[PDB]
Symmetry: D2
Subunit: 169 residues, 4 copies
């Protein structure tokens, strides 16, 4: 467990990609006319949600939810209703796609006007369950990453950039 | 809010009906062979659960879940995994069928081997949604019942019998 | 893990002790005049709570709560308030006394009129944290018990009696 | 309910104040040596948390907790253990001091190495309970503020600045 962390994706770059995601999300929803709510998955999405929602130029609500990353259970459900609203699930990263997949199903049952997912990172190679992912900040190989909500031994979660854990020998 | 409570279903009557329900549920699942779990919906069904599981002659586990009743949110999810298991949802009362209908959808997503519902009381005259109910203790008229876990303004759950509030008397 | 279960405390005896606990609890509170609420710890106390509350002859509420049996956390808090009320925590068994001890502290902060604990079983020898326990159904040595809410490998939780797990070789 | 929103604290002003708070908190805990954890109180403080932890130059973990505000109930407890750790409760706003006062009592029970509070906004003119607040971003007049995580009828949390609702205008 002896190691070091080096910057992989500088915060300045993360900020740029998010602003763009924001324009994209805004453009995609600005004319819906229905209520919108960004749904972040805890703990991972807190930082990403913070920045992202500020880049979304349409009036919207911000709610969080926390699932158990065998059965995907709900430790903390949404505080507000989503029925008839536009819901954009926000996660820091998708790899296997299991939790995201199940969470999308659960929310689907509440009959929202629509459902989409926006992740800061995407690890295509690790996918195990195909699930739609409308907005992605970065596509990366299966690297040992941390920061921006992603931890390693309850650490680096507060880093302003995405770094890679170099596992010293 | 001034009111009276009259007996609707005496304790002995309930005790007998539950023994029967027990035999029936037992007969149904005795030859399944996969794990079985009864899921009571807090708060109202804790008493019915306590008595019912004691009449179920097949080895099972007991878990609980608490749900809201606009969107149906999970205030307390199961501690157990139900995937590939016979699941018997234990409810105290079904009238409109909204909440149960949804709770059932949510568990269905976890892919249990089988999914059924067992309710103590049933007000068919109140049904708004078609929902499969495999076991019913009593089909009753549209009375405001209390006791045996059920309440009236956080009151009467401890009554050993199902009673009906009269009011203005 | 190969074993068998033999009856240690017959349900008929459990029922008798509970009726007596009920008289004792009733006598102790009947003149308070304040609101009363029995607080059961999930999953363990569901069955005991069911029977016990029926033996308590004073008007009271029934709420449940579930803690994490290193830090004692609250997975599901009470649905109702206890401030200014008489609160009787109900558990199936106390051994180390850790969870019970912490739960009593947490509820204490809400300033209830009073706080007491009632357990069906007590394992004095295993105590690690001294905490008051006003009502006990049975005092037993450190036996491998199951039933009446107490499980073993998600099993025997529904047994109507307290049995001892004979660990066959 | 007809209203207007005016800027009260511009985004740049907040950004600068947080950098300062960051230096201060860093200076305070840099030589402690035990694990440290910032606990944000959902929902209102997710944004302040996101920005604050990035200015804290000491290795820490980030966790969240959601509480009610008559009795103070835990709707979502921490995922981490705080025993023997420096704990920095991260709040968005403190006015009466009731909720924080209680949340602090609850965590205090888990025996952390140290326990402090850091709030972005403060309405001293609204204080009803004496509660220790170690770090404050801004002491403000009694205005109904929104933005930067804070809301008005589930609205405005995404604003990058603290604004004040005007109403009937
Ligand atoms: O007579 C009643 N008094 C109090 N609550 C009731 C009564 N009938 C139904 N409920 C509530 O409605 C729920 C069942 O709703 P359903 O599944 O939508 O039919 C129960 O779990 C109860 O909490
Ligand atoms: O101006 C306001 N608008 C909306 N909610 C507020 C406002 N001021 C305080 N609150 C709520 O009150 C809580 C703080 O209460 P305290 O800790 O009891 O002082 C915050 O977490 C908010 O949820």
């Amino acid at each position: 467990m002896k190691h070091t962390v080096e910057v992989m994706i500088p915060e300045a770059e993360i900020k740029a990609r998010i602003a763009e995601l924001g324009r994209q999300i805004t453009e995609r929803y600005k004319d819906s006319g229905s209520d919108m709510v960004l749904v972040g998955l805890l703990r991972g999405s807190f930082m990403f949600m913070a920045d992202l929602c500020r880049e979304v130029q349409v009036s919207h609500e911000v709610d969080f939810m926390t699932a158990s990353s065998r059965d995907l259970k709900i430790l903390k459900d949404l505080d507000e209703d989503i029925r008839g609203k536009d819901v954009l699930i926000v996660e820091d990263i998708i790899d296997s796609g299991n939790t995201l997949s199940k969470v999308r199903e659960i929310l689907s049952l509440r009959e929202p006007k629509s459902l989409a997912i926006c992740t800061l990172l995407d690890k295509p190679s690790r996918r195990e369950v195909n699930v739609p992912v409308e907005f992605i900040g970065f596509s990366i190989p299966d690297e040992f990453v941390v920061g921006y909500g992603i931890d390693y031994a309850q650490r680096y979660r507060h880093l302003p950039y995405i770094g890679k854990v170099i596992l010293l020998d």
